[PDB]
UniProtKB/Swiss-Prot annotation, chain A:
The gene is rplO. One of its GO terms (biological process) is cytoplasmic translation. This protein binds the 5S rRNA. It is required for the late stages of subunit assembly, and is essential for 5S rRNA assembly onto the ribosome. The lineage of its organism: Bacteria, Pseudomonadati, Pseudomonadota, Gammaproteobacteria, Enterobacterales. Belongs to the universal ribosomal protein uL15 family. This is Large ribosomal subunit protein uL15. Disulfide bonds: none annotated. Coiled coil: none annotated. GO terms for cellular component: cytoplasm; cytosolic large ribosomal subunit. Keywords: Ribonucleoprotein, Ribosomal protein, RNA-binding, rRNA-binding. It comes from Escherichia coli (strain K12). Part of the 50S ribosomal subunit. Contacts the 5S rRNA. GO terms for molecular function: rRNA binding; structural constituent of ribosome.
Curated annotation (Swiss-Prot), chain B:
Part of the 50S ribosomal subunit. Cross-links to the P and E site tRNAs. One of its GO terms (biological process) is cytoplasmic translation. Belongs to the bacterial ribosomal protein bL33 family. GO terms for molecular function: structural constituent of ribosome; tRNA binding. This is Large ribosomal subunit protein bL33. InterPro entries: Ribosomal_bL33, Ribosomal_bL33_CS, Ribosomal_bL33_sf, Ribosomal_zn-bd. PANTHER family: 54S RIBOSOMAL PROTEIN L39, MITOCHONDRIAL, LARGE RIBOSOMAL SUBUNIT PROTEIN BL33M. The gene is rpmG.
UniProtKB/Swiss-Prot annotation, chain C:
GO terms for molecular function: ribosome binding; rRNA binding; structural constituent of ribosome; tRNA binding. It holds the Pfam family Ribosomal_L27. GO terms for biological process: assembly of large subunit precursor of preribosome; cytoplasmic translation; cytosolic ribosome assembly; positive regulation of ribosome biogenesis; regulation of cell growth; ribosomal large subunit assembly. This is Large ribosomal subunit protein bL27. InterPro entries: Ribosomal_bL27 (IPR001684), Ribosomal_bL27_CS (IPR018261). PROSITE patterns: RIBOSOMAL_L27. It comes from Escherichia coli (strain K12). The gene is rpmA.
Curated annotation (Swiss-Prot), chain D:
PANTHER family: 54S RIBOSOMAL PROTEIN BL35M, LARGE RIBOSOMAL SUBUNIT PROTEIN BL35M. Residues 1-21 are annotated as: Disordered. One of its GO terms (cellular component) is cytosolic large ribosomal subunit. This is Large ribosomal subunit protein bL35. Keywords: Ribonucleoprotein, Ribosomal protein. Gene3D superfamilies: 4.10.410.60. Residues 9-21 have a biased composition (Basic residues). Pfam families: Ribosomal_L35p.
RNA sequence: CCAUAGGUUAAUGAGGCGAACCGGGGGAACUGAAACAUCUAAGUACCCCGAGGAAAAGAAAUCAACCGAGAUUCCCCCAG
RNA sequence: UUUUGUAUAAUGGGUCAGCGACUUAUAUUCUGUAGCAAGGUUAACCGAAUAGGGGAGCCGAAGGGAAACCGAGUCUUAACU
RNA sequence: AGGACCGAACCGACUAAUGUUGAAAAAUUAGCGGAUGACUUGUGGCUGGGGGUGAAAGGCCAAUCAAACCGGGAGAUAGCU
RNA sequence: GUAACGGGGCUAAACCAUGCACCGAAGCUGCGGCAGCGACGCUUAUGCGUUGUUGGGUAGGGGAGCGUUCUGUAAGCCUG
RNA sequence: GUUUAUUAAAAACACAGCACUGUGCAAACACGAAAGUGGACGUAUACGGUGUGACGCCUGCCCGGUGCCGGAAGGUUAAUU
RNA sequence: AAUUCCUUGUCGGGUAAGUUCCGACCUGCACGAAUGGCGUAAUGAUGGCCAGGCUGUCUCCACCCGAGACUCAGUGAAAUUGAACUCGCUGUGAAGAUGCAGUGUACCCGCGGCAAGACGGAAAGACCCCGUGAACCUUUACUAUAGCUUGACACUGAACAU
RNA sequence: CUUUAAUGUUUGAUGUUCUAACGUUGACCCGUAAUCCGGGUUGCGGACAGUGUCUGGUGGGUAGUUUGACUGGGGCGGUCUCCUCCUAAAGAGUAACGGAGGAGCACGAAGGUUGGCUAAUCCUGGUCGGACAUCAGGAGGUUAGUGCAAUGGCAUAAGCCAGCUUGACUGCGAGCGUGACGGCGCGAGCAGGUGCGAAAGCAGGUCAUAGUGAUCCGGUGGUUCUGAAUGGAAGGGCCAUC
RNA sequence: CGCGGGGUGGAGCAGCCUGGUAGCUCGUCGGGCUCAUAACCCGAAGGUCGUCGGUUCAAAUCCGGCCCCCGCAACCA
């Protein structure tokens, strides 16, 4: 980023936003990953055990990506609408 | 650049303000214009205030 | 000397010529005055820039008592 | 050793889905009353880095 | 005046040298920043003192997050 | 060699022999090539041991948004044709 | 008597030619100035580098001086050759 | 130093006009050879009967190789 | 008299003399993180600095500027509170 | 005028002739009073000018004496050097040619001399420019800072007044 | 509250005096054979001085630096950004220390719209009144006007009056133009809400092209977006703006 | 921008300093006086007392916004 003596593209442009500390401790879970856990029950701890999310993760989200075949009980976790529907179709359960 | 800049503030009570220029030497009296407040979504009176 | 100055070129002139099929909104002429006047289906900008108000072909023509160049768009 | 990211560049650019970079537009910072509303509005949304200077950005941000 | 300072003996130890490593006391500049002064180089080079086979550190007025961990040092991550 | 251009009266070389200049380490990116493949691979370390263990991690399989948040959508906006 | 005079030693260094890969990294011969003084010389000692010393020329400080020399930072840096 | 046809020389061996010859280059053609790049069709050892075309080159980009010292193959093979 | 040792010996420096100025002695000033030392075992007829430069006749006007010396009524003004 | 640009100012002296010198004038580009002014005996390897004496300084060189140079014997360097079978001229040419073109001249090889050319040798020009080089020096450049100086608190206390 | 007096006592300053810190480069004694140094006695000074921390001033004494580029060499002079014309070779663009000129704004109307209107100059007549005010009429035909330079425009007037007004709106924006990029420009239409008009319609500043400055760093207002155990807050972000 | 202080006849300064109140130095004219410019006196013209609103009977005098002049430190991308 040295453009001769011209103000280089990054110095030209304004800085924007901020880095969220809450974003670093959130995780994103595919439906394909709900099979990898054991017992057919999906908590944060269980996910961690499976080695899907990571240790320093406080919050986790289930996304309609891939597919779930087995009935799965999602516990204390945020689930997107499509993903929820998929889970229901599979024969699963979502409780808060 | 004798024309100073001023801030037209909404009478609606919202923090919304327009900004503009005004020659204060020729026009001592305050500027009043009915402008659109985008927060209330109405055309409200905007009295002149200092840019601060 | 008191002479070394000149302004940056404004890249004016006819951008889309006769028979040239354009999309609506396409600038046909950038100009200073109304050297060309907006005819049928052509809009005139604030800086007298002529632009298509419809998709179709550019049609230059001489019209009117003052014999002025009118740009119209004919639909295809 | 590891390449260091140009930290200013990191502040100003975010890598996107297809591996481009969005940035906030220049000129919407101050001296605004004189700029037309329309212009300001156009400046507001974040825009992709051009094809020309993309390379430079990439060089700046190896971890992106 | 007593005392104290001092003085004469006696005993024990120390002194100096030594590569690097270590702890501490001082501590640059060239250089990079395409100039340069903040900044960088770098607590680096160097100077000095002290020690040991290692040194230093070390047994929470420490973290963590409402669950818990449980002194120090060292390595890989975390993470450019 | 440098040059727009050198027989140049521009540079360099008295000659020979020997030596004399794009390397290495660690990161990153693209290309080839091999492995396995929605998975891939381990690091330190254990292990006399280039085996095997070790998956801590990293990269990938989802993005959008400054962010909360939402999520094959999302941000934008009171709302988007 | 004398920073008196003329003039050897001694101290200097104005002109000159020579020399300029010299006899010599400053000399030679011919002349020249001072020559009891602010003289000169021996031996020893002290002043150290932004420091000394300087009747001052940026002079001199080991044939080196608008900042000595030696080692280190150091393979400084060199958009130049 | 002739020195303002390159020289000798020339009344044409000068100039203008028309024509027919010839010389003249690494241009084009002829014969032989090598290489790149495309086709189409073989029936293959992944290239081949063929068929067009291309092949000056600095900076520079791409491709394919030779040779050197050293390690394995090698207590093999060559070598008084 | 001195000077650019090694291209400049001079009109340059020094000089006796003159003037200003600082300095009362634990001096001013200088070298010293400091102790201390020089000044000076001196003491204003002395010492430092600056300029001028034997001697003779002399050395005129300007204090607005920049310094320096004296003044403190007001304005402004730090740490502190 | 160690100062005067115009300027070799003008007038005078000196000389056959004097941009220098000396004396004046003043029209001081741009002297001037202790970064002293003007005088000044003496002194000076001091600057300028004139005269006498003297002379090879010169007219204009001649001869001689020695040391080299030259030849022989012995020893025995150096700078420099792309390679050379290393001519003139006119032209051409990266624009000044031993090397190219055209042309002229020239048997091969020494030695003593000279120095016009080899843009001869000697030092990566000292001049000039350039480099976001260097250094020293400078100041009312900027930023610092030693020092000097001001106050507050500290070491630092007691009475009595105003 | 304005303004002071009385009786009782807590920080300022300004002296007077004292001694016990401190100073003593005063005298004598001792360690001691010793002009150092220390201890003692004593005189003087004395809470000053002087040192440390903080602080204002001064501070080429010293240091680190600095001191632009273009340029028919460099310096000196001039220039550096933006607009208009020409150079510019009939698309765009196009250089020179080429030839000419301007800008660093202005305007709450000089913006919007509805309704209306048409200029310069000259001649003739007309009180003061004249080459030139104001009034007629003719010729004249935009030679005028454009808030300002130049160019291109402009009667449908973009020129000149009058009424009512804030569209000099907020969110957007198909599609274009122009730039290496940063950017800069034109823009129909859609949503909301407004003004003028009977209505069709027009209005997202001004006839157009100059009138300007990236980033960082900060300032103000709004916004529960964020908020380092949690609730808050601070700070940060986002929108507006300096 | 933050804070402080001022806008007083033609000029500067008192009157604010907690409302009941236009004086000072000149300047100009006129008169007396002088040889007189002057010195000196008498007499007079000349001030929304920055602007405006409020409390109040009464303000230049108290306060609020606003405008200008000055000082202050402060950073200044
Ligand atoms: Mg720049
Ligand atoms: Mg894990
Ligand atoms: Mg902003
Ligand atoms: Mg020892
Ligand atoms: Mg530095
Ligand atoms: Mg430096
Ligand atoms: Mg640098
Ligand atoms: Mg230990
Ligand atoms: Mg517990
Ligand atoms: Mg060469
Ligand atoms: Mg050249
Ligand atoms: Mg050639
Ligand atoms: Mg050559
Ligand atoms: Mg040659
Ligand atoms: Mg060269
Ligand atoms: Mg070589
Ligand atoms: Mg050579
Ligand atoms: Mg690689
Ligand atoms: Mg790969
Ligand atoms: Mg003598
Ligand atoms: Mg003598
Ligand atoms: Mg002699
Ligand atoms: Mg030095
Ligand atoms: Mg000198
Ligand atoms: Mg020497
Ligand atoms: Mg130095
Ligand atoms: Mg270094
Ligand atoms: Mg080097
Ligand atoms: Mg001839
Ligand atoms: Mg042939
Ligand atoms: Mg051929
Ligand atoms: Mg052929
Ligand atoms: Mg080829
Ligand atoms: Mg060919
Ligand atoms: Mg001497
Ligand atoms: Mg000498
Ligand atoms: Mg000399
Ligand atoms: Mg000499
Ligand atoms: Mg003198
Ligand atoms: Mg005087
Ligand atoms: Mg003075
Ligand atoms: Mg004075
Ligand atoms: Mg004073
Ligand atoms: Mg003069
Ligand atoms: Mg004469
Ligand atoms: Mg004379
Ligand atoms: Mg003088
Ligand atoms: Mg003087
Ligand atoms: Mg003198
Ligand atoms: Mg002498
Ligand atoms: Mg040799
Ligand atoms: Mg020639
Ligand atoms: Mg010869
Ligand atoms: Mg020669
Ligand atoms: Mg010779
Ligand atoms: Mg030469
Ligand atoms: Mg050179
Ligand atoms: Mg002393
Ligand atoms: Mg300096
Ligand atoms: Mg230059
Ligand atoms: Mg020039
Ligand atoms: Mg054109
Ligand atoms: Mg053209
Ligand atoms: Mg109209
Ligand atoms: Mg209009
Ligand atoms: Mg207008
Ligand atoms: Mg305009
Ligand atoms: Mg900056
Ligand atoms: Mg909290």
């Amino acid at each position: 980023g040295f453009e001769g003596g011209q103000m280089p593209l990054y110095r030209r442009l304004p800085k924007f936003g901020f880095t969220s500390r809450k974003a670093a401790i959130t995780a994103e879970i595919r439906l394909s990953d709900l099979a990898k856990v054991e017992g057919g029950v999906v908590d944060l701890n269980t996910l961690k055990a499976a080695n899907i999310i990571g240790i320093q993760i406080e919050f986790a989200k289930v996304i309609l990506a891939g597919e779930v075949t087995t009935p799965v009980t999602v516990r204390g976790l945020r689930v997107t609408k499509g993903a929820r529907a998929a889970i229901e179709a599979a024969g699963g359960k979502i409780e808060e | 650049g004798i024309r100073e800049k001023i801030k037209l503030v909404s009478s609606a009570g919202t923090g919304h303000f327009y900004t503009t220029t005004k020659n204060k030497r020729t026009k001592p009296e305050k500027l009043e214009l009915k402008k659109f407040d985008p927060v209330v979504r109405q055309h409200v009176i905007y009295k002149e205030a200092k840019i601060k | 000397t008191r002479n070394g100055r000149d302004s940056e070129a404004k890249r004016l002139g006819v951008k889309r010529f006769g028979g040239e099929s354009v999309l609506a909104g396409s600038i046909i002429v950038r100009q200073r005055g109304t050297k060309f006047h907006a005819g049928a289906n052509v809009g005139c900008g604030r800086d007298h820039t002529l632009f298509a108000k419809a998709d179709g072909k550019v049609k230059f023509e001489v019209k009117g008592p003052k014999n002025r160049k009118f740009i119209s768009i004919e639909a295809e | 050793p590891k390449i260091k990211t140009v930290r200013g560049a990191a502040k100003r650019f975010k890598k996107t889905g297809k591996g481009g970079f969005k940035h906030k537009h220049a000129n919407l910072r101050h001296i605004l009353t004189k700029k037309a509303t329309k212009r300001k509005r156009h400046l507001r949304p974040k825009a992709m880095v051009s094809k020309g200077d993309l390379g430079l950005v990439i060089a700046c941000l190896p971890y992106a």
